[PDB]
Amino acid sequence: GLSDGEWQQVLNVWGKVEADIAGHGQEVLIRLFTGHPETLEKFDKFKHLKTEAEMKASEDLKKHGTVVLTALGGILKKKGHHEAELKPLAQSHATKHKIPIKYNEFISDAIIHVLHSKHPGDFGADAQGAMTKALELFRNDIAAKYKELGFQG
């Protein structure tokens, strides 16, 4: 999937996200919600936010941010050996939350954006390459599980 050199890059970048999981989590979800308003409708607890200020002022949104990035970090530290960690995720987003694979695409892009925004100039081309490949692997493995379930939509 990835070489050990590329995994090394991913984990180096992840070190930036661990220094402020809540600020990073928050900005990823705001970037998603503002850029793709339909994603907001999948969250009954956040569908009430209409402005970004409101979003920025929501402590519950920062909390969910932490939950998401904690789960992602766990998976990335497995360097592709994440079947155990991913099956459950895949299963709940397909059967319970009914999240199209496309939104995983969106959040993937929103991570890259936020890293460039918070770390201008020290999110290099090699680092971007490794991070993108890692997210792709994650997305691909999810998609495999969605297929088994026939979560067509």
Binds ligand HEM (CB under 6 A): choice among 57, 67, 144, 149: 67
| Binding status of residue 48 toward ligand HEM by CB under 6 A | no
Q: Considering the complex, what minimum distance in angstroms separates the CB of residue 105 from ligand HEM?
A: 9
Binding part of the chain for ligand HEM, among 10-18, 50-58, 85-93, 143-151 by CB under 6 A, reads 85-93
| Binding status of residue 26 toward ligand HEM by CB under 6 A | no
Q: Considering the complex, what minimum distance in angstroms separates the CB of residue 121 from ligand HEM?
A: 25
Give DSSP secondary structure letters for the chain: ---HHHHHHHHHHHHHHHTTHHHHHHHHHHHHHHH-HHHHTT-TTTTT--SHHHHHT-HHHHHHHHHHHHHHHHHHTTTT--HHHHHHHHHIIIIIS---HHHHHHHHHHHHHHHHHHSTTSS-HHHHHHHHHHHHHHHHHHHHHHHHHT---
93 marked ligand binding residue: yes
Q: Considering the complex, what minimum distance in angstroms separates the CB of residue 6 from ligand HEM?
A: 19
| Binding status of residue 103 toward ligand HEM by CB under 6 A | yes
| Binding status of residue 43 toward ligand HEM by CB under 6 A | yes
